[PDB]
Amino acid sequence: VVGAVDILLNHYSTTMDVAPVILAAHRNNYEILTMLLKQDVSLPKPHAVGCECTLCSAKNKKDSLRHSRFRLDIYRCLASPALIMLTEEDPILRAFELSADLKELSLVEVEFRNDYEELARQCKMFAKDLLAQARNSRELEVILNHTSSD
Amino acid sequence: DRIPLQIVRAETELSAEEKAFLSAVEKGDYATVKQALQEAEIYYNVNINCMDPLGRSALLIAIENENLEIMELLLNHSVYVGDALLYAIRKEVVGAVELLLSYRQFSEFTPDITPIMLAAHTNNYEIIKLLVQKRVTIPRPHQIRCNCVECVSSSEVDSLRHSRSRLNIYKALASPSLIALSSEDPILTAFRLGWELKELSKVENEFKAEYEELSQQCKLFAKDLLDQARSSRELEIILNHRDDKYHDLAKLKVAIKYHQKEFVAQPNCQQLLATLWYDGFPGWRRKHWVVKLLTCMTIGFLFPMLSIAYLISPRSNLGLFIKKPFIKFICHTASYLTFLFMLLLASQHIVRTDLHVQGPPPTVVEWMILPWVLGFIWGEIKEMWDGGFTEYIHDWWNLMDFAMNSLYLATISLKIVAYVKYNGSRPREEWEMWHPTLIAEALFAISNILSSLRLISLFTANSHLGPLQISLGRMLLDILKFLFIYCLVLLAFANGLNQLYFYYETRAIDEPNNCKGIRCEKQNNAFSTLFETLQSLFWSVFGLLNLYVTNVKARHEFTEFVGATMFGTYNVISLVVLLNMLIAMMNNSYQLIADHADIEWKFARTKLWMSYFDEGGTLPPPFNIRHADSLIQNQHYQEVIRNLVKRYVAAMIRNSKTNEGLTEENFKELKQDISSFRYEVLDLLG
Amino acid sequence: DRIPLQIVRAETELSAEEKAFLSAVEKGDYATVKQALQEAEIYYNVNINCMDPLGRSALLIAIENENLEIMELLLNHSVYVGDALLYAIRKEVVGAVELLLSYRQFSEFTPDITPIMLAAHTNNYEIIKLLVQKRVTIPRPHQIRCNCVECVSSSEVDSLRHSRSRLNIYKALASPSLIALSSEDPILTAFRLGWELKELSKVENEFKAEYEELSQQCKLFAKDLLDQARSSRELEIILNHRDDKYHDLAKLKVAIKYHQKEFVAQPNCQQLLATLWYDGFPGWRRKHWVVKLLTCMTIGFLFPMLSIAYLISPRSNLGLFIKKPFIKFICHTASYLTFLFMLLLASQHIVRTDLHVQGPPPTVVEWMILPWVLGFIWGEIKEMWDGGFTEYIHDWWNLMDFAMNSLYLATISLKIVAYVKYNGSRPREEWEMWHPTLIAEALFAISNILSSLRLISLFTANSHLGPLQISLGRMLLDILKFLFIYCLVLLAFANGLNQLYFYYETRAIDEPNNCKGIRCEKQNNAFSTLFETLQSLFWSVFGLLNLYVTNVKARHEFTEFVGATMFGTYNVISLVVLLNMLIAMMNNSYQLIADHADIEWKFARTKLWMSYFDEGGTLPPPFNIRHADSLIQNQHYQEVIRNLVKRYVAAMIRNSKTNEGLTEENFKELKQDISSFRYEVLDLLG
Numbered sequence A: 001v002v003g004a005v006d007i008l009l010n011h012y013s014t015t016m017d018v019a020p021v022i023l024a025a026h027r028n029n030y031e032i033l034t035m036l037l038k039q040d041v042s043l044p045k046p047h048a049v050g051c052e053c054t055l056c057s058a059k060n061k062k063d064s065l066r067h068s069r070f071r072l073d074i075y076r077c078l079a080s081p082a083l084i085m086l087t088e089e090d091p092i093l094r095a096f097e098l099s100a101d102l103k104e105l106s107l108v109e110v111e112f113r114n115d116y117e118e119l120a121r122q123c124k125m126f127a128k129d130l131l132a133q134a135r136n137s138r139e140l141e142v143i144l145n146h147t148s149s150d
Numbered sequence B, C: 001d002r003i004p005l006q007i008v009r010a011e012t013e014l015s016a017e018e019k020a021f022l023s024a025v026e027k028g029d030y031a032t033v034k035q036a037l038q039e040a041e042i043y044y045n046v047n048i049n050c051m052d053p054l055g056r057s058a059l060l061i062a063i064e065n066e067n068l069e070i071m072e073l074l075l076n077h078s079v080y081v082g083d084a085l086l087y088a089i090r091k092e093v094v095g096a097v098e099l100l101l102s103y104r105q106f107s108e109f110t111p112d113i114t115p116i117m118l119a120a121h122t123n124n125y126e127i128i129k130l131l132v133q134k135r136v137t138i139p140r141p142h143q144i145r146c147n148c149v150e151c152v153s154s155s156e157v158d159s160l161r162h163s164r165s166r167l168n169i170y171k172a173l174a175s176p177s178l179i180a181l182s183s184e185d186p187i188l189t190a191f192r193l194g195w196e197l198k199e200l201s202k203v204e205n206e207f208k209a210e211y212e213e214l215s216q217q218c219k220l221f222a223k224d225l226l227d228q229a230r231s232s233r234e235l236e237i238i239l240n241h242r243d244d245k246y247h248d249l250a251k252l253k254v255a256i257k258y259h260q261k262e263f264v265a266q267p268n269c270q271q272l273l274a275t276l277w278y279d280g281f282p283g284w285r286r287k288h289w290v291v292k293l294l295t296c297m298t299i300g301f302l303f304p305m306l307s308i309a310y311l312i313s314p315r316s317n318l319g320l321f322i323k324k325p326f327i328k329f330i331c332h333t334a335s336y337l338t339f340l341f342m343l344l345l346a347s348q349h350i351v352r353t354d355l356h357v358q359g360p361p362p363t364v365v366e367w368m369i370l371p372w373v374l375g376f377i378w379g380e381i382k383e384m385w386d387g388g389f390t391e392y393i394h395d396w397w398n399l400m401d402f403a404m405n406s407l408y409l410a411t412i413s414l415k416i417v418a419y420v421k422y423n424g425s426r427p428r429e430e431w432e433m434w435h436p437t438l439i440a441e442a443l444f445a446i447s448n449i450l451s452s453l454r455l456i457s458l459f460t461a462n463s464h465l466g467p468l469q470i471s472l473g474r475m476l477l478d479i480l481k482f483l484f485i486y487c488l489v490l491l492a493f494a495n496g497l498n499q500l501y502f503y504y505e506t507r508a509i510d511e512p513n514n515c516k517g518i519r520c521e522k523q524n525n526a527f528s529t530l531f532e533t534l535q536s537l538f539w540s541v542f543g544l545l546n547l548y549v550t551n552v553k554a555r556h557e558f559t560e561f562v563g564a565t566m567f568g569t570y571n572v573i574s575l576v577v578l579l580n581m582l583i584a585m586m587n588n589s590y591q592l593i594a595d596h597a598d599i600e601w602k603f604a605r606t607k608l609w610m611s612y613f614d615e616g617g618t619l620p621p622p623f624n625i626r627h628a629d630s631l632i633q634n635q636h637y638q639e640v641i642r643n644l645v646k647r648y649v650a651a652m653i654r655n656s657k658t659n660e661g662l663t664e665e666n667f668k669e670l671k672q673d674i675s676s677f678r679y680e681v682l683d684l685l686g
């Protein structure tokens, strides 16, 4: 609604402190995300499938399904073009790296492969689109000859 | 010249006043409509219940335009309301409430359709709920093939109606929303209904497609409800519910029974099963590729011990280890593999035996093979008994198992028989064609081939090979059909060829090297006999039949030419035409099968995993030596089901609102909204 | 842990007042907007030229909602109008008139887009007409390979810009509307432009798809204008128009030159050609197939008669008959068939010539064949002369004609070289390998193959074989590509096997029956020489190479094994891998080809028919014995073009209106419309 989101702020459920952002990102709404991210937010980091401490073992014991859905939701958020644009210094590199991760996860989480793969393709497309916006060749050079390493 | 055009089947025409009345309704001018009505009451100049060229009356026009204001006006003036409810239900609007509240020849609805049936057909949860709130009933369709009931003997009269009426009933009973609102166990109801509908698809040759579609609707509904699960606690409550032990994945088993593949393949469901399968191998799949191989190989090598431990101390660390499903699979496969290896040792004839001894004492390797054989037998026996013949009979591989085993039995019998009799030794050459030892060897060879090809079943456990195995099976059905046609052609040409060359058959002695047939250095007497002609034609398909076989020694040119021409036509029909056509057909199917490959494979894999999930299992070589509870369970299932249904209905609605285009009816509605609005404002301002 | 989320693309936020102003524009509250504007003047609390985070300023927000009233209000006040015209053009509003009338970084439009270009890219006839009315110019796109101009040779400054800029001009020049409004011969320009765009697609590899899309756009436009023809008079005026005799189907010819296939295949165009083709046989379409057959047969049989009459007295009625195109085709086909029959007789005892007379005298049959051969060559010469090397060369079949004719010439030469220098009659077995007579016979036979294959060309004429011929030809291209891949495979294994067995070569003498090679009863030394290796591997594709060709005489097990493995791998790669792939590839190609076969076939047939429509035609055997007018013609063409363009513009609009869903933006406008009306009414009534 945007207007409504504004009003509410003016005054499933995989979480609640960050669920607004997680949903917005899924809603891929730049405006709403801009509003929400105004207040500092910190999505939890999806621990890798490898962990075995209660960190994950306990959860994977209480509710494996929820845990899995939770992680997918975090990634579905992190892989939102809007969020990458707003929060990442180098949007392209993030898309490259995240696409790689979302693929690995497809292999690991065989159950939700299609989901994790769609997200990967989404990231790949985003980067292509951002390149498509180049207009002169000076820009192309800056982009294709830049490194994130000192 | 010119073709005059006239209205042949003429119908009464609307007077000018009546035309205006209906026109107002289409524009939503309450004022004019109201006035017209009032005047009609006085001067009786308009039949309030007049009809348009399309047969729509005023109330029907109002219903379609969805103008409840005008509808009320018309109803207050007591307009014929026949079938109006049905039209409203089809439009799926809240005008239904008004008509129901307003309670007390041409129709677009057959005489059988009832308010609830149509609501079900529309799948509008709200309208259905409204109707059900008031007593409503859908006739129970008689069981498939219920001739006993003379009522079914009504088919003699207006079968068309009978058939349509039945389909309408099922089309309603199979509405996701009705099943949701009415059925106590929505999932089980869908499973069952989807099966009955499939059966009907077969019995009712015509209307097959409809019944099949309705069946898929039911199947998908069940998967969709499962998809609305959010926690493992729910998923477990659903999949382990027994209608009436528990914790036996009862519902999953029912699904497998009703071939509910999509349900059994749902990601979350597959996840649970995996946890059960790889118990004891945390992240076995995650284990590095090699690591997996390592563990599997090691466990396999230790299969006899693990087996022995279970035999010794069921309640021991080792004894318990074999109970794990994945371990059983590893062991039960390693056992079979060793069996096959033993059979290979025979090839190399590691234990060589004289070719002259009739019925020799079973060789060393044989003895070793004997146990496994016996184990496999008893195994099949157990399956049959435990599962009942129907189920055992159903399994196709069971046929291969039965055949493989039977061959092994005969082999043994003959081996034995050849021992008691034919106890002496003679040059193999002297042995009669059907010497027991000879026949036994052949049977053994065939059995060995069958045994090794039984490994194909194991492919279902592999992510890569499995899907292929499943697809192949599906295609095989079609290949069989093609084979029947090929056979007919073969028989035809076989009869013909044999008919022409049988006059020129020659003796084996006459033939060089006393060899007669298509399998001699110089092929001869190929078409002399039907048996030989059939063989020759078969081998020709592979190009192993030389062309010189088409000439008769006496050299009768004409005959030979006809013979070669017949052989040639066969080659063209078989290789150039039929063979190629098979390619096209197989390409068509493979394409389709590919669409549903995963669900098929996963359904198959589950069945396999489930088999091991059970408790009655040891490798073949060592194979042969309170109502309160139910109440609670049901209560929980009902709670979960309630939530699942709730979240499902909502989802469906949301999807429709956001994933549906705007049709012309929508434009007409908006246009009416503005029109009626205009007229009102103008009247007020006027 | 946690992943921090911070905004790095920091952006200023609009003041509440500002933000509010923008919201009012979106809702269409003229009043509030008006107030805000006035207050901002005096108070200066809101920059009227502020922007949304999405870069939507007020004027832009108004243009998109298409509220010209608010637009005027905003424009009246001093609101920056940068690039607004472009937005008003992209959206295709005619509120562009207002902006054009007013005249007092991070842009969504590249710095090169000028209003005229954008309008053209949108293809709005109206909007374009407005702008064009005012003097407007689109830069010339320097021709392909115009590197000479240092202007383009300075692309080093910014290539991407240069390339993009170039595409934008063409994307504009290739707009059907701009070509309708600004070009004198809309049809010719589209033909030419289509070609250039095609060529550019090739030179500019990147943007290939874009240029190709544009070319198709131009081709479709020309066809559509043609389809707007409503009388045969118009169709003639168009197809027979010469830009600069007339009445020669000039534009039809140019269309064939530029490969405007669709234009040529257009129903009407085809119909006209047909009438010209079947002149002399009106109703030939109605003629019963049998009747037709009869007519064709008679004419063909009498071909010599008709052929002569013309020569003697073209004016003679009979002379007139052969001039008709369809006739020419029939006569010319009969001549070819007669020729082919002559060739067949040559291989028979028709003349029963001796077979040991080295340098024999030409037989009667050969003598008769000579005239035809001469005619065919002469025809080719004329073709080259009357069509230029380019056209002749372009034709694929002219290649075969050349080959056939050249061989039928070398045959003659060698025959002569043999009549001389060979007066004896030595035994054929004594003749050397390259005896001229032997070489001559070989060439003649090869040509007889080519000659008989030329008949495939005639298929284009039939409505059934024609399309098939075309489709197959296209698929041949695909096969050719595959052969390249295979060739490398062949070469690899050829070299390997030769490198392994070349040591074990043996003299033919040693071999049985003094025969050395794959074409000997006992295939021997098949891999000893490279050439044999290539041939042997080639034949192995057809299973004509025996496996005993891989065993060295000395029986070196290792070498033989390596060889067999190499041969086997080749067979797997070629027969089981590449071959099966080719099949799949071809399957796909046919599916696609089949779709365009008709346009492809009709274009082909028209070229054939056109060939005969021309006046210079006699069968091969008897082959070798005003400014005023221009102005009027052009006026007529312009008249027809005016009508066609008008009809086209209207038709395209109708199609756009009747075939385009209501996008979301459309909805937004309606909502804004109601909103504005609401505010206005509320105020007046409040």
Ligand SMILES: CC(C)CCC[C@@H](C)[C@H]1CC[C@H]2[C@@H]3CC=C4C[C@@H](OC(=O)CCC(=O)O)CC[C@]4(C)[C@H]3CC[C@]12C
Binding pocket: B333, B455, B458, B459, B460, B461, B462, B463, B465
């Ligand atoms: C290719 C030639 C040498 C024939 C080899 C015969 C056997 C040694 C192969 C043929 C099929 C193979 C089986 C194919 C399927 C599987 C599934 C595989 O499991 C998986 O791939 C995923 C893990 C899981 O099973 O849960 C375990 C090995 C096994 C039984 C394979 C064991 C080795 C088999 C019996």
Ligand SMILES: CC(C)CCC[C@@H](C)[C@H]1CC[C@H]2[C@@H]3CC=C4C[C@@H](OC(=O)CCC(=O)O)CC[C@]4(C)[C@H]3CC[C@]12C
Binding pocket: C333, C455, C458, C459, C460, C461, C462, C463, C465
């Ligand atoms: C099948 C075997 C016996 C080879 C026969 C060789 C020729 C006798 C055949 C092969 C292709 C045939 C040609 C295929 C195409 C045509 C088009 C056909 O015209 C039509 O089908 C439609 C009427 C029209 O041409 O306008 C006239 C006969 C002709 C020349 C056919 C004449 C007879 C041909 C030369």
Ligand SMILES: [Ca+2]
Binding pocket: B380, B383, B397, B398, B401
């Ligand atoms: Ca079994």
Ligand SMILES: [Ca+2]
Binding pocket: C380, C383, C397, C398, C401
């Ligand atoms: Ca030519």
